[PDB]
Design a protein around this motif. Structure first.
Motif, short mmCIF file in Angstrom:
data_model
loop_
_atom_site.label_atom_id
_atom_site.label_comp_id
_atom_site.label_asym_id
_atom_site.label_seq_id
_atom_site.Cartn_x
_atom_site.Cartn_y
_atom_site.Cartn_z
N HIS B 57 0.82 -1.21 0.00
CA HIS B 57 0.00 0.00 0.00
C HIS B 57 0.86 1.26 0.00
CE1 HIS B 57 -3.59 -2.47 0.87
NE2 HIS B 57 -4.26 -1.41 0.46
N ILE B 58 1.96 1.25 0.77
CA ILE B 58 2.87 2.39 0.78
C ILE B 58 3.48 2.61 -0.60
CG2 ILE B 58 5.04 3.26 1.74
CD1 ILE B 58 4.37 1.77 4.31
N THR B 59 3.92 1.53 -1.25
CA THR B 59 4.50 1.64 -2.58
C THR B 59 3.46 2.12 -3.60
OG1 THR B 59 6.09 -0.10 -2.05
CG2 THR B 59 5.73 0.38 -4.38
N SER B 60 2.22 1.63 -3.48
CA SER B 60 1.16 2.03 -4.40
C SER B 60 0.82 3.51 -4.23
CB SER B 60 -0.08 1.16 -4.18
OG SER B 60 -1.22 1.74 -4.79
N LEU B 61 0.77 3.99 -2.99
CA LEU B 61 0.47 5.41 -2.77
C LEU B 61 1.64 6.29 -3.20
CD1 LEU B 61 -1.31 5.23 0.72
CD2 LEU B 61 -2.37 5.57 -1.53
N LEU B 62 2.87 5.80 -3.06
CA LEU B 62 4.02 6.57 -3.51
C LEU B 62 4.07 6.66 -5.03
CD1 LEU B 62 6.38 8.16 -2.39
CD2 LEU B 62 7.78 6.10 -2.59
N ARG B 70 0.35 10.65 -2.32
CA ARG B 70 1.80 10.84 -2.23
C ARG B 70 2.21 11.43 -0.89
NH1 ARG B 70 1.56 11.91 -8.04
NH2 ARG B 70 1.16 14.13 -7.64
N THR B 72 0.50 11.22 2.00
CA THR B 72 0.31 10.17 2.99
C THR B 72 1.41 9.13 2.89
OG1 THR B 72 -2.06 10.57 2.75
CG2 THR B 72 -1.39 8.60 3.95
N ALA B 73 1.85 8.82 1.67
CA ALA B 73 2.98 7.92 1.48
C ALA B 73 4.22 8.46 2.17
CB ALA B 73 3.24 7.70 -0.01
N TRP B 95 11.74 3.39 -2.49
CA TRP B 95 11.11 4.53 -1.84
C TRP B 95 11.94 5.80 -2.03
CZ3 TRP B 95 9.43 1.99 3.46
CH2 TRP B 95 8.37 1.11 3.20
#
Lengths: 395, 550, 550, 395
Positions: B57-62, B70, B72-73, B95
């Protein structure tokens, strides 16, 4: 709970022909706690009594009957300097970055190891400066003319001062050569004291900012060295009769305080805390550990002796160095954050130049910012988060 | 099973749309900081698969298009690298490139600032492990520096900077953090940094651009710490050359500022006062790389000199890679020259020799611009003292004379008085215990001024002014580190009155422990009855009651 | 002979264009603050002529069309009312209406904020002079209040607020400062403030607006201090009714928050828990004026409860006009109810009783939500200790139990540990020397955790942390205000070792002042050799060295 | 300007027919410095020994014979309250806003004046409680049964406490009724002490937290009243022989400290600092000034003596109040910041209620905002100005 370390220096030729220790090695560095081992060595020096100084970066060692100070880089393990002085060294100490040297001609010298200045005083003494001690404000020099002179550090180290330096006071009640000097941790005018030791079998406790002689102590033999306990309660004194005595200043009968006698009346100490055999010989130097429960002595036959002050047990031999242990200096187990680190030293030179101070600047956060709090805090602070969200949602 | 905080993180990230995620951002990273355990565990259990889903989820939001996602990431990478350890440091390789892509993309500047802070934390944490440096920190670093320099690069002379100077300050702070750790990587970029931060070192009023104090400090710090990137161990040489050039710039600015008055100062280092034209407004600077932006006007020259003095202060407030040669003689000469030109008493314009071809408006501007320069000089002395400590004992006599002269010249300015009190505290703490009677006599007016300020604040002549706080911090030092045998009895009485009526327990304890001898030799009575009644159970009196401990 | 500062001010105001005057504002303010004499001189000399010209030019800038000139006028008016005294106060009647006109006209927000600060400073300074309130403050104040309430009043139900919430914060702060002094004048405006500040008291995640923390605090302070405007001396009755309504709202919110956990709590005051529907998400709030804005979700109920607890904290953070009946029993019962529900250890969720109908996701959200509620309760307890001082000795036993229970429930959260350390220091300083053996035994894990945090920060298991600072502040209190006879010897040894390794001078002084007593009777050694060798020149260490040794 | 004030309370009928001095006035409020001057009067009180308490809002005065306490408001200058206690009042002191009352039955009431809550200890004393002293942590009650009981304040006063209150320790090496008690301000377990005077001509210095007798002093007459000096250096005691005795703990022969003798050794004190003529009478009450240089003694004949310890051994008459001056209490010249103000006092009552606290909340500025820096700073702060300028120039 702590790892204490101590540096020893040897002097003279080796007494025994065959030994496991190298005949070349002159300075040893050992760890006392939790186990005794030689952590490091330094190669070539012949250090007389009171001619050793240890800092966090360097070890300064005066040579025997020579105008040479060998400087060893403790952070590199080798010898950095062979610094020459105008006169031979009888004693030397280190305070801050100033090496205070009492010479053989009655002179006081101050070498600033970070700038290269070598301030010399006129020969107020008439014989060799035997022992030297330093406070953050004063320097006391006791010589063989039964005289101790007190000097002020600021007027000694003033930049453009060309007038002849003079001592503030002359603590002269002794009648023989001053063997040892110790100074109380205090520096206030009314709460300080300094304890001398001379060859007239005597030790005088003075107030070195007023000149008053607070106490006189007679030992059966003339003292060689003393050490104050960390709480400034007891004065451990080695004598010529191969004995270490403990004089307790503030005990059941106070030497100094409200219940004391007159300063003119002399107190005699005749009870030895410890004794050494004639083959051991009298202790050339004394030192007390950081905790104060443990005491170390250096003996001319090469052995280091551990004494338990609290348990009052028998002394035990650590190791034999085959040469006279003239200097033993403990190192503080804790590290004090010093603002500048003296990686290298500047040799003393007399030339026309600007005042330059040479050191390295350490990072200790003299500056602060809102972003430093963001970096150091785990996550972001709530207020900075809130401001960032508001700025993000602001069109 | 899974931690409840981590389950909340997964549920809220799954349910919440990407738009409202920044409004729920403080919740998520709070739960992540609570969940320090499973993230630190190296990489199927429920905990493991939810950590994998969370990282996905972190990678998808980034990598997502949404700027809110972005942001929130970026906050989530910051939280995970804070409470994740070596596993997160090793798994945070895409990241870093995502954060650099965020900086490239036209994103909001708060998001860019948080990306910059997160990247700086990444590189500082990566400095600890050696292999991580070569495996991601070395290649990604030129791209991040290129992005920052493109953001803060001036577009043209006519085109102003798009990003605010606060964002420029954030970039300067991040580069200041990174140049110490990575010198060789920042060595190619060192040229653009100087050209970018040249107009913010000593800004003037002739630039018409408002430059923040934080930007000034960070630009000074970065141009001083750029000596770390000097090749072939030229760090000390560049440091000495730069500080000497700064001293020379101060001297050349001081000429144009002090064209109005004769100076009786004769240099002990070699500098000579070149003649200055007496026609028109004073001016200085240039467009060369070794010179600061130009200024015209006496107020602008005073601002330039103050900025250069604070630049000199930043040299002692910043660390050095190698041992360096500090020109203490040149600094003392410069401070003596700047402090020898003093404000007057009222109605004494003929007291100091002045030019007859220079306007009275220019005079009245200079004579008011002077106390700011004196305050900057005193702050420079404070920084030198805080850096040197016992090695500045040879400098004690000159700093005392300069401080006394400045304070007696500008005793009606609270900022000058406060700076004088702080410097007096530092000097007295270092080498104040052995000052002679003449030094005590010339320091007496500062003692009286400090006592007057403390008594005025206490109402025995209201909120606590900074000058009152500085004098209150100095009041115990007048007892502890000042020779009382050279002190007049009236000053001792004033100090005791000030301590009692101000309820300074430190000063009352110091007065009790450092009694005043008269000419008779009898000690004065102790303040102690007042201290024990104002603070009956404080440590100050509990330590004095130690004779009953048994 | 006018001051050179005044000549510089007049010349720069005459020559400098109004568009560049805001950039010249910082030096002009310094020069005006230097101009203390002539501005305070009551009403020919050049000083009087220049003062009259300066005031005329200030009035021209304030009444001019230039917003930059208006901003410069606001800055100069603030400086003049700060430095000039009563003459500058009485010569400021058009200035007040001009400052209100700055607020009314579409000027930028920084100019409006500085005008609000200047007007608040004016109305505060007029309180010293009784007549100037009558001629000056009383007529102009309703217009200022009307302008502020027009700025912060919502334009429509379907339209967002025009002004930023940071500006609403400034307006609320100004009104909070003015209600305490002008209750009668702004009595009619109390109705609009209570409607305007309603969303900002306890904002939740369902409000879809990120409310600033300072705005929350200032809104809470304003709605607490709005009891000053109560007619017929109803200030105390309104304060008591409002705080009891807040306690009731806390209980009703805590019902919906704690519907999952079956509670064994009973009320001494007599409050009974209403039944809560098992179906649906937990909801609370309404559209009524007296009650807070509605919230949806268990987490949102948790921030509602936290905000209400912080509002109760603000009650003890704000002063009152008249003596009031503080419901200490109701507050203690509320905190007991909120602290009797605790998060479990790993695997004790089955041990803690839960409602069967509540789902696992709602449960996990609840046990994540509990530590923040406990933190808010502990902060409220700290505020109660600070306000009451020796009047919370009756409450001392219960807060110890709640603190120990909360810390043992969540000993892994650094914020909860830091708050527990602060509350422990306050309680032990209040009533700690008479704690029984049972209380000393149950506060032992707090001692162990504090020593562990201090040693971890010192490195003898890091850097500076708030938890480490709180534990280091708490560390001397364990010697000074705790029974040494009830302490186990290992605890005393751990405390002494922690003090030595952390170099805490106050803790080491306390340990030397309090020797430890065992059951056998042997003297344990003191840590005085460590203290004298680490801090040799300290005055209290010298007294200990000269007293304890004897 | 610092003005030192004291409150006097008189008891009994007038002894001379003087129309100038009103009979019904019972309480006076005076200035000692810079000169004697009667500030204010309070009406209709006959206050015996140790029944007066003064705080910055109120004066509490227990009544002779009646089981009443009169509460007077110093702020409003009137008699606020007539409060009736369940039993006869013999002694009365105030700690904080909590009134400690010792009865003739042997009971102690702790009455909180703000919450209106009365806590009654069981009659652990078999006769009348004569004297009481207090700290923020302990209460010491010395009674006619030759017993001194030490109580924990936090244990005495709790919510929902139903267990019968018991003293922590009992000090009973006296053999007569306890006349006076004084307690050092230190609350530490190792430095605290109390000094007690009883009718057996003896004063004992106790460590009331450890229950150890530090020192015993014997006087020719039994001590009527006692006060320690502020700096805890000496005890000033009056006797039945109309004499005033001084006892310094740290003299050349110290009563306490390291140089002191054994606690079993009893010191004889026979040298009187001062004496009063029998027409003045013995000092019924005593108080010590803020600096400690002066002490006021009230005599049942009506005179007030001022004693200057350094200057004049003979006392100096301030005035005659025409009645037995039973109480003299000094007031501190400095204003102390207290977070709550007790304007009104809740009467004692026994009923079921929630624990309610009644006080006025003063402004202490516990809440800090960034706007307060701009408000309280001269001009504006530089960062605030420059932020405003940047946001102004920004669109």
């Amino acid at each position: 709970m702590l790892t204490e370390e101590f540096v020893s220096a040897i002097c003279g030729p080796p007494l025994s022909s065959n030994t496991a220790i190298a005949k070349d090695v002159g300075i040893y560095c050992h760890t006392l706690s939790p186990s005794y081992s030689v952590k490091s060595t330094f190669k070539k020096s012949s250090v007389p009594v009171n001619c050793l100084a240890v800092s966090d970066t360097h070890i300064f060692a005066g040579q025997h009957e020579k105008a040479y100070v060998h400087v060893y880089s403790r952070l590199r393990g080798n010898q950095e300097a062979f610094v020459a002085l105008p006169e031979r060294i009888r004693c030397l100490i280190l305070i801050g970055d100033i090496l205070v040297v009492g010479t053989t001609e009655g002179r006081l010298m101050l070498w600033e190891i970070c700038t290269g200045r070598l301030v010399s005083t006129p020969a107020r003494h008439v014989q060799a400066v035997s022992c030297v001690a330093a406070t953050p404000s004063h320097v006391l020099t006791g010589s063989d003319d039964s005289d101790i002179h007190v000097w002020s550090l600021s007027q000694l180290l003033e930049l453009d001062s060309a007038a002849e330096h003079e001592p503030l006071r002359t603590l002269a009640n002794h009648r023989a050569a001053i063997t040892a000097l110790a100074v109380s941790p205090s520096d206030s005018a009314d709460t300080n004291f300094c304890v001398s030791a001379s060859k007239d079998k005597s030790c005088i406790i003075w107030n070195y900012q007023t000149g008053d002689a607070l106490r006189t102590l007679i030992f059966p033999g003339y003292p060689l060295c003393m050490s104050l306990d960390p709480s400034s309660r007891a004065i451990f004194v080695s004598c010529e009769d191969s004995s270490l005595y403990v004089a307790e200043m503030f005990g059941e009968k106070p030497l100094l305080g409200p219940g004391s006698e007159d300063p003119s009346t002399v107190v005699q100490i005749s009870t030895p805390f410890g004794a050494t055999q004639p083959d051991v010989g009298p202790a050339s130097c004394l030192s007390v550990s950081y905790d104060g429960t443990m005491l170390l002595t250096g003996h001319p036959r090469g052995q280091i002796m551990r004494w338990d002050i609290s348990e009052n047990k028998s002394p035990v031999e650590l190791a034999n160095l085959n040469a006279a242990v003239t200097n033993l200096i403990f190192v503080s187990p804790f590290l004090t954050s010093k603002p500048t680190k003296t990686v290298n030293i500047i040799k003393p030179s007399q030339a026309e130049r600007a005042y330059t101070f040479t050191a390295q600047f350490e990072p200790m956060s003299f500056t602060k910012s809102r972003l430093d709090s963001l970096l150091n805090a785990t996550g972001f602070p709530a207020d900075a988060l809130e401001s960032a969200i508001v700025a993000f949602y602001q069109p | 099973t899974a931690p409840p905080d981590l389950r909340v993180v997964c549920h809220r990230l799954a349910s919440t749309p990407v738009d409202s995620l920044p409004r729920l951002c403080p919740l998520l990273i709070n739960h992540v900081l609570r969940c320090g355990g499973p993230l630190s565990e190296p990489q199927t259990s429920e905990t493991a698969m939810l950590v994998h889903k969370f990282r996905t989820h972190i990678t998808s939001l980034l990598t997502g298009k949404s700027p809110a996602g972005r942001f929130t990431a970026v906050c989530l990478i910051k939280a995970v690298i804070d409470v994740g350890g070596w596993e997160s440091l090793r798994s945070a390789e895409p990241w870093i490139r995502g954060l650099i892509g965020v900086l490239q993309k036209p994103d909001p500047l708060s998001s860019k600032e948080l990306s910059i802070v997160t990247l700086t934390k990444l590189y500082i944490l990566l400095q600890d492990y050696q292999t991580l440096i070569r495996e991601m920190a070395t290649p990604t670093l030129p791209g991040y520096a290129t992005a920052c320099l493109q953001l803060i690069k001036p577009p043209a002379s006519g085109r102003p900077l798009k990003v605010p100077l606060n964002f420029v300050d954030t970039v300067a702070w991040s580069l200041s953090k990174l140049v110490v750790l990575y010198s060789t990587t920042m060595r190619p970029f060192s040229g653009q940094i100087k050209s970018a931060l040249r107009p913010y070192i000593a800004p003037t009023s002739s630039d018409n651009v408002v430059v923040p104090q934080s930007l000034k400090e960070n630009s000074r710090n970065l141009l001083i710490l750029l000596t770390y990137t000097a090749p072939k161990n030229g760090s000390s040489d560049e440091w000495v050359k730069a500080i000497r050039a700064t001293i020379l710039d101060c001297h050349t600015t001081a000429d144009q500022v002090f064209r109005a008055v004769r100076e009786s100062w004769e240099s002990t280092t070699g500098y000579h006062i070149q003649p200055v034209n007496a026609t028109g407004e004073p001016s200085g600077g240039g467009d060369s790389v070794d010179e600061l932006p130009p200024w015209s006007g006496l107020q602008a020259g005073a601002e330039r000199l103050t900025g250069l003095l604070e630049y000199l202060t930043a040299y002692f407030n910043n660390p050095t890679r190698a041992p360096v040669n500090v020109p203490l003689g040149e600094l003392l000469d410069l401070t003596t020259r700047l402090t020898l030109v003093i404000p007057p008493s009222l109605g004494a314009e003929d007291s100091i020799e002045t030019n007859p071809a220079i306007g009275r408006d220019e005079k009245a501007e200079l004579w008011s611009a002077l106390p700011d320069i004196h305050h900057a000089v005193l702050r420079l002395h404070c920084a030198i003292i805080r850096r040197l400590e016992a090695n500045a004992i040879p400098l004690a006599t000159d700093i005392i004379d300069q401080m006394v002269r400045v304070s007696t010249a500008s005793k009606q300015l609270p900022s000058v008085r406060e700076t004088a009190y702080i410097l007096a505290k530092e000097i007295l703490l270092l080498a104040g215990s052995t000052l002679p009677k003449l030094t005590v006599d010339i320091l007496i007016p500062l003692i009286q001024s400090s006592c007057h300020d403390i008594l005025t604040a206490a109402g025995h002549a209201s909120t606590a002014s900074p000058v009152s706080q500085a004098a209150s911090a100095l009041l115990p030092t007048f007892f502890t580190h000042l020779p009382q045998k050279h002190l007049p009895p009236d000053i001792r009485g004033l100090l005791d009155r000030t301590a009692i009526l101000s309820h300074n327990q430190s000063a009352m304890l110091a007065s009790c422990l450092h009694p005043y001898r008269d000419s008779r030799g009898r000690y004065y009575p102790s303040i102690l009855p007042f201290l024990v009644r104002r603070f009956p159970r404080d440590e100050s009196v509990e330590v004095l009651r130690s004779n009953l401990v048994k």
